């Protein structure tokens, strides 16, 4: 049976999983979404006239950067318990990644839902970003608003974009980043807890190698790329489990570890799932992770196919949308970017 | 039906295929092996007490280097018509690659045998080096003699090794190499006939990328790694054919082109099959190509298995061995390195 999110507004508990120092935690664990008297409705494919074109974060136009910055400002200015707010959007990640929900609807009220460390990883975050993007656009009345994406697979895109830097006057800034690494600028997609002492050009090549590893060498079929099978009745797969898919375990994990501030108790913000969403760059890193799924399929190598297992196809989550409506979304419906009305600007 | 070499001492003709400028050729086209009145014996697996451990050319012990150099000197000192002589060993490549033999033993006396550009590539060169290596060891009384291999998949092994340089006093030297490239030292495994003009470190990273391309991205199954099916009655597959396997067409071809001297009429020596064997580095390049077969299997990826088609297994060649006996060898019998009593020193 497929993993099925419950009525997240009725069955939810404070996050208590996968956070090593909770007494010292600098972000809240009260990650449950607000109740607004809404009924959960099924997703319907969007009627957008145009496809939203996500843009490399190092090559944005003035309008792209300004709109993104203004949308994040608007999101930050919302009351916290507005489901569209900066805090609410961060909390989504916390609730789904750190034990807010159970498998009660599947007959396992005693087992939490975890969307990481399995084949749920790619489609959960695709949907998370889908609504996030639509919410941001709605806040600035831009019906074709598109996220930037951190193109760390392209040399010039590897430095964290200066749009995220500066101080708190910049809505895209977050003080809770590794200061040494921000100074270094170039992300280490192979970061394993110790700084490489290598030339920038070598790090660029290392990052290129890492993308090759995640997309070709280790991602040779759906199990190894998307991650292991995870169905109702299954306990949560541990961080670092070898059954985790290549991108999730690889480049994905590295960027989180590298940006997260090691002086913080749980390496907040990016260094733990529960806090990662308080860093605006979280979503923009994840936009390129989302793109990796696209690229992986474009390679047209043996085994580079989407999942057809019904227990994956029919897995579902619940999100607030830009209308503060509750939407149930299914893995099967996010495999086709054209139907979700967004894509990525390529070379 | 399998490709089957004839009695090479009875049916043989001068090489006249694949050589663009025959009249200006700086090496011989009369590549037929000598006649000593020997019968052709069936292969017997070797009873070597120790496994021959082929050593990276850039990190040999003093004994490894001195033994190799002395063995080549001894090989160059042999009478020309000794089938073990330097030129006789070079001629083997010429005969099997440039039209010395026909498929007479298969009932096709007017069709040439070609061992390149097909699934015969790897096993033919494996056997060729097997006897070459045993011959060298026998000339200096080193029963456990092993060849070096040009480890151009490892950064410090990418420069052509100093042991091949100097001038005519060095048995390992060959004047017919691209002087500009010998100056550059670092081989370009992605060489397409145009110098890249990039930083050494970049070329190193490119070479590593090229190895992953040949072994993982393009060598996805036996057809794409080993090359196309080639059986009795087939005409020679043309250089550049899309059916050529990934290593043969990729890194393998690149090293030949890069080392070969473009000021020579057929880019002798390494730049044409018929002359490649006059460059000692030919065999040492090919020892690493041989190693790629091993590595490709060790990747433990779907499709990375040996050929089971009888028309490949039962294909055979004839070589002189270290005792000047004629030996017929089959593809099926070279798939296991333990049984051939050699391997490669790894990190």
């Amino acid at each position: 049976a497929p993993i099925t999110a419950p009525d997240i507004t009725s069955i939810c508990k404070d996050a208590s999983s996968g956070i090593g120092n909770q007494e010292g935690a600098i972000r809240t664990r009260k990650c449950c979404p607000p109740s607004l008297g809404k009924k959960i409705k099924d997703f319907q494919f969007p009627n957008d006239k145009k496809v939203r074109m996500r843009w490399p974060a190092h090559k944005g136009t003035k309008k792209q950067v300004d709109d993104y910055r203004r949308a994040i400002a608007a999101m930050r200015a919302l009351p916290d318990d507005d489901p569209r707010s900066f805090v609410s959007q961060a909390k989504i990640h916390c609730a789904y990644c750190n034990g807010g929900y159970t498998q009660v609807d599947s007959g396992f009220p005693d087992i939490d839902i975890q969307i990481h460390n399995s084949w749920l990883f790619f489609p959960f975050h695709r949907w998370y970003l889908y609504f996030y993007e639509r919410i941001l656009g709605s806040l600035i009345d831009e019906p074709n608003f598109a996220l930037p994406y951190w193109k760390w697979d392209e040399p010039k895109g590897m430095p964290i974009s200066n749009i995220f830097l500066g101080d708190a006057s910049n809505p895209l800034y977050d003080q809770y980043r590794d200061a040494n690494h921000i100074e270094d600028r170039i992300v280490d997609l192979d970061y394993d807890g110790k700084d490489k002492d290598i030339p920038d050009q070598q790090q660029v090549a290392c990052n290129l190698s890492t993308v090759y590893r995640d997309l070709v060498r280790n991602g040779v079929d759906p199990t190894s790329f998307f991650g292991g099978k995870y169905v109702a009745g299954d306990s949560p797969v541990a961080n670092g489990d070898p059954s985790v898919g290549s991108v999730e375990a690889g480049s994905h994990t590295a960027v989180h570890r590298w940006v997260g501030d090691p002086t913080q108790p749980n390496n907040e913000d990016m260094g733990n799932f529960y806090s990662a969403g308080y860093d605006p760059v979280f979503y923009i890193h994840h936009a390129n992770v989302d793109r990796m799924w696209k690229l992986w399929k474009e390679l047209r190598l043996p085994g580079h196919v989407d999942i057809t297992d019904p227990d994956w196809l029919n897995a579902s989550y619940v999100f607030y949308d830009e209308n503060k409506d509750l939407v149930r979304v299914y893995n099967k419906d996010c495999v086709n970017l054209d139907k979700l009305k967004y894509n990525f600007i390529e070379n | 039906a399998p490709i089957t070499a004839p009695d090479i001492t009875s049916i043989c003709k001068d090489a006249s295929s694949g050589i663009g400028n025959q009249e200006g050729a700086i090496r011989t086209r009369k590549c037929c092996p000598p006649s000593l009145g020997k019968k052709i014996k069936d292969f017997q697996f070797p009873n070597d007490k120790k496994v021959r451990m082929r050593w990276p050319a850039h990190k040999g012990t003093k004994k490894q280097v001195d033994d190799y150099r002395r063995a080549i000197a001894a090989m160059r000192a042999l009478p020309d018509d000794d089938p073990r002589s330097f030129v006789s060993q070079a001629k083997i490549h010429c005969a099997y690659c440039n039209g010395g033999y026909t498929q007479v033993d298969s009932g096709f006396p007017d069709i040439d045998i070609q061992i390149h550009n097909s699934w015969l590539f790897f096993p033919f060169h494996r056997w060729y080096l097997y006897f070459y290596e045993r011959i060298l060891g026998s000339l200096i009384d080193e029963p456990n003699f092993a060849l070096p291999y040009w480890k151009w998949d490892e950064p410090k092994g990418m420069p052509i090794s100093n042991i091949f340089l100097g001038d005519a006093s060095n048995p390992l030297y060959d004047q017919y190499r691209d002087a500009n490239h010998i100056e550059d030292r670092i081989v370009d495994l992605d060489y397409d006939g145009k110098d890249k003009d990039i930083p050494d470190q970049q070329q190193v990273a490119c070479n590593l990328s090229t190895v992953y391309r040949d072994l993982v991205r393009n060598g996805v199954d036996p057809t794409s790694f080993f090359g196309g099916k080639y059986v009795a009655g087939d005409s020679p597959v043309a250089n550049g054919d899309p059916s050529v396997g990934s290593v043969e067409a990729g890194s393998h071809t690149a090293v030949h082109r890069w080392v070969g001297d473009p000021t020579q009429p057929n880019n002798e020596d390494m730049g044409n099959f018929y002359s490649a064997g006059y460059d000692p580095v030919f065999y040492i390049h090919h020892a690493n190509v041989d190693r790629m077969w091993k590595l490709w299997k060790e990747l433990r990826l779907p499709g990375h298995v040996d050929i089971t088609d009888p028309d490949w297994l039962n294909a055979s060649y004839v070589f002189y061995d270290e005792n000047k006996d004629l030996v017929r060898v089959y593809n099926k019998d070279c798939v296991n390195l333990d049984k051939l009593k050699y391997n490669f020193i790894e990190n």
């Binding site: 192979d190 290598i198 090549a205 290392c206 | 490892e154 590595l295 990190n347």
Partner: peptide
């Protein structure tokens, strides 16, 4: 083989 620019022995 498996030497990459990420490795310290590179």
């Amino acid at each position: 083989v498996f030497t990459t620019p990420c490795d310290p022995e590179y």
